């Protein structure tokens, strides 16, 4: 998916916020990996997306 | 500080001994006793029973 760069800290076990509890929640006993990279060159519009 | 328990920093101290017959320089706190000779006794010399 695509989220705001600052909200990237909300994708983690034991976290709280807005995206964490309303859009995507990870379990406390979660195993795996998370990969996020900047994509302002690909998903940006001068008018606004 | 808002990370999960699995990502909070932990301070680690590792103690490595080299227990050997060499004359020990570090010893635990014990008490000495007067020397007794020429009879069946139970002795303890620098941890050697």
PDB file of C-alpha atoms in Angstrom:
ATOM      1  CA  UNK A   1       0.000   0.000   0.000  1.00  0.00           C
ATOM      2  CA  UNK A   2       0.990   3.683   0.143  1.00  0.00           C
ATOM      3  CA  UNK A   3       0.956   5.920   3.262  1.00  0.00           C
ATOM      4  CA  UNK A   4       2.510   9.270   4.341  1.00  0.00           C
ATOM      5  CA  UNK A   5       6.248   9.055   5.195  1.00  0.00           C
ATOM      6  CA  UNK A   6       5.758  10.264   8.807  1.00  0.00           C
ATOM      7  CA  UNK A   7       3.075   7.571   9.449  1.00  0.00           C
ATOM      8  CA  UNK A   8       5.623   4.858   8.614  1.00  0.00           C
ATOM      9  CA  UNK A   9       6.406   4.574  12.333  1.00  0.00           C
ATOM     10  CA  UNK A  10       2.838   3.386  13.002  1.00  0.00           C
ATOM     11  CA  UNK A  11       3.414   0.034  11.239  1.00  0.00           C
ATOM     12  CA  UNK A  12       4.983  -1.961  14.075  1.00  0.00           C
ATOM     13  CA  UNK A  13       3.935  -4.355  16.861  1.00  0.00           C
ATOM     14  CA  UNK A  14       2.585  -2.633  19.950  1.00  0.00           C
ATOM     15  CA  UNK A  15       2.048   0.709  18.224  1.00  0.00           C
ATOM     16  CA  UNK A  16      -0.916   3.081  18.426  1.00  0.00           C
ATOM     17  CA  UNK A  17      -2.122   6.000  16.335  1.00  0.00           C
ATOM     18  CA  UNK A  18      -4.568   6.449  13.455  1.00  0.00           C
ATOM     19  CA  UNK A  19      -3.336   4.161  10.667  1.00  0.00           C
ATOM     20  CA  UNK A  20      -2.449   1.545  13.290  1.00  0.00           C
ATOM     21  CA  UNK A  21      -5.911   1.165  14.833  1.00  0.00           C
ATOM     22  CA  UNK A  22      -8.214   2.261  11.977  1.00  0.00           C
ATOM     23  CA  UNK A  23      -6.494   1.097   8.765  1.00  0.00           C
ATOM     24  CA  UNK A  24      -3.822  -1.562   9.410  1.00  0.00           C
ATOM     25  CA  UNK A  25      -2.963  -3.267  12.706  1.00  0.00           C
ATOM     26  CA  UNK A  26      -0.107  -5.683  13.317  1.00  0.00           C
ATOM     27  CA  UNK A  27      -0.324  -8.326  16.061  1.00  0.00           C
ATOM     28  CA  UNK A  28       1.733  -7.982  19.218  1.00  0.00           C
ATOM     29  CA  UNK A  29       3.289 -11.426  18.644  1.00  0.00           C
ATOM     30  CA  UNK A  30       4.243 -10.641  15.055  1.00  0.00           C
ATOM     31  CA  UNK A  31       7.140 -12.150  13.114  1.00  0.00           C
ATOM     32  CA  UNK A  32       8.233 -10.918   9.709  1.00  0.00           C
ATOM     33  CA  UNK A  33       9.676  -7.805   8.102  1.00  0.00           C
ATOM     34  CA  UNK A  34       8.525  -4.376   6.941  1.00  0.00           C
ATOM     35  CA  UNK A  35      10.023  -2.593   3.921  1.00  0.00           C
ATOM     36  CA  UNK A  36       9.247   1.039   3.094  1.00  0.00           C
ATOM     37  CA  UNK A  37      11.039   3.368   0.684  1.00  0.00           C
ATOM     38  CA  UNK A  38      10.398   6.864  -0.626  1.00  0.00           C
ATOM     39  CA  UNK A  39       8.355   7.024  -3.831  1.00  0.00           C
ATOM     40  CA  UNK A  40       7.770  10.748  -4.315  1.00  0.00           C
ATOM     41  CA  UNK A  41       9.050  10.473  -7.894  1.00  0.00           C
ATOM     42  CA  UNK A  42       6.378   7.919  -8.858  1.00  0.00           C
ATOM     43  CA  UNK A  43       3.165   8.876  -7.008  1.00  0.00           C
ATOM     44  CA  UNK A  44       3.148  12.684  -6.929  1.00  0.00           C
ATOM     45  CA  UNK A  45       1.070  15.164  -8.931  1.00  0.00           C
ATOM     46  CA  UNK A  46       1.697  18.905  -9.144  1.00  0.00           C
ATOM     47  CA  UNK A  47      -2.028  19.558  -8.760  1.00  0.00           C
ATOM     48  CA  UNK A  48      -2.214  16.833  -6.105  1.00  0.00           C
ATOM     49  CA  UNK A  49      -3.065  13.159  -6.257  1.00  0.00           C
TER      50      UNK A  49
ATOM     51  CA  UNK B   1      10.844   5.313  24.049  1.00  0.00           C
ATOM     52  CA  UNK B   2       7.676   4.434  22.106  1.00  0.00           C
ATOM     53  CA  UNK B   3       9.144   1.263  20.579  1.00  0.00           C
ATOM     54  CA  UNK B   4       7.958  -2.210  21.473  1.00  0.00           C
ATOM     55  CA  UNK B   5       9.555  -4.343  24.153  1.00  0.00           C
ATOM     56  CA  UNK B   6      11.414  -6.260  21.447  1.00  0.00           C
ATOM     57  CA  UNK B   7      13.192  -3.130  20.211  1.00  0.00           C
ATOM     58  CA  UNK B   8      13.948  -1.274  23.449  1.00  0.00           C
ATOM     59  CA  UNK B   9      17.668  -1.015  24.268  1.00  0.00           C
ATOM     60  CA  UNK B  10      19.158  -3.534  26.682  1.00  0.00           C
ATOM     61  CA  UNK B  11      22.456  -3.104  28.518  1.00  0.00           C
ATOM     62  CA  UNK B  12      24.525  -6.297  28.563  1.00  0.00           C
ATOM     63  CA  UNK B  13      27.499  -7.144  30.790  1.00  0.00           C
ATOM     64  CA  UNK B  14      29.419 -10.378  30.177  1.00  0.00           C
ATOM     65  CA  UNK B  15      31.761 -11.796  32.822  1.00  0.00           C
ATOM     66  CA  UNK B  16      34.372 -14.297  31.639  1.00  0.00           C
ATOM     67  CA  UNK B  17      36.477 -16.204  34.162  1.00  0.00           C
ATOM     68  CA  UNK B  18      39.519 -18.410  33.602  1.00  0.00           C
ATOM     69  CA  UNK B  19      39.287 -20.679  36.651  1.00  0.00           C
ATOM     70  CA  UNK B  20      42.671 -22.366  36.929  1.00  0.00           C
ATOM     71  CA  UNK B  21      45.340 -23.649  39.317  1.00  0.00           C
ATOM     72  CA  UNK B  22      47.316 -20.415  38.912  1.00  0.00           C
ATOM     73  CA  UNK B  23      47.473 -18.293  42.093  1.00  0.00           C
ATOM     74  CA  UNK B  24      44.133 -16.491  42.108  1.00  0.00           C
ATOM     75  CA  UNK B  25      44.185 -12.691  42.208  1.00  0.00           C
ATOM     76  CA  UNK B  26      40.417 -12.203  42.677  1.00  0.00           C
ATOM     77  CA  UNK B  27      38.621 -14.110  45.440  1.00  0.00           C
ATOM     78  CA  UNK B  28      35.209 -14.041  47.049  1.00  0.00           C
ATOM     79  CA  UNK B  29      34.671 -12.770  50.583  1.00  0.00           C
ATOM     80  CA  UNK B  30      35.476 -15.453  53.160  1.00  0.00           C
ATOM     81  CA  UNK B  31      37.225 -15.716  56.524  1.00  0.00           C
ATOM     82  CA  UNK B  32      40.640 -17.139  57.317  1.00  0.00           C
ATOM     83  CA  UNK B  33      41.328 -19.498  60.215  1.00  0.00           C
ATOM     84  CA  UNK B  34      44.365 -20.544  62.232  1.00  0.00           C
ATOM     85  CA  UNK B  35      46.451 -23.353  60.766  1.00  0.00           C
ATOM     86  CA  UNK B  36      46.069 -26.833  62.292  1.00  0.00           C
ATOM     87  CA  UNK B  37      48.711 -29.492  61.679  1.00  0.00           C
ATOM     88  CA  UNK B  38      49.127 -33.244  62.189  1.00  0.00           C
ATOM     89  CA  UNK B  39      45.507 -34.377  62.509  1.00  0.00           C
ATOM     90  CA  UNK B  40      42.612 -35.415  60.285  1.00  0.00           C
ATOM     91  CA  UNK B  41      40.973 -32.129  59.245  1.00  0.00           C
ATOM     92  CA  UNK B  42      38.807 -30.735  56.451  1.00  0.00           C
ATOM     93  CA  UNK B  43      40.727 -28.014  54.614  1.00  0.00           C
ATOM     94  CA  UNK B  44      39.846 -25.378  52.009  1.00  0.00           C
ATOM     95  CA  UNK B  45      42.703 -23.649  50.165  1.00  0.00           C
ATOM     96  CA  UNK B  46      41.638 -20.954  47.677  1.00  0.00           C
ATOM     97  CA  UNK B  47      38.536 -22.933  46.758  1.00  0.00           C
ATOM     98  CA  UNK B  48      40.313 -26.313  46.746  1.00  0.00           C
ATOM     99  CA  UNK B  49      38.484 -28.646  49.128  1.00  0.00           C
TER     100      UNK B  49
END
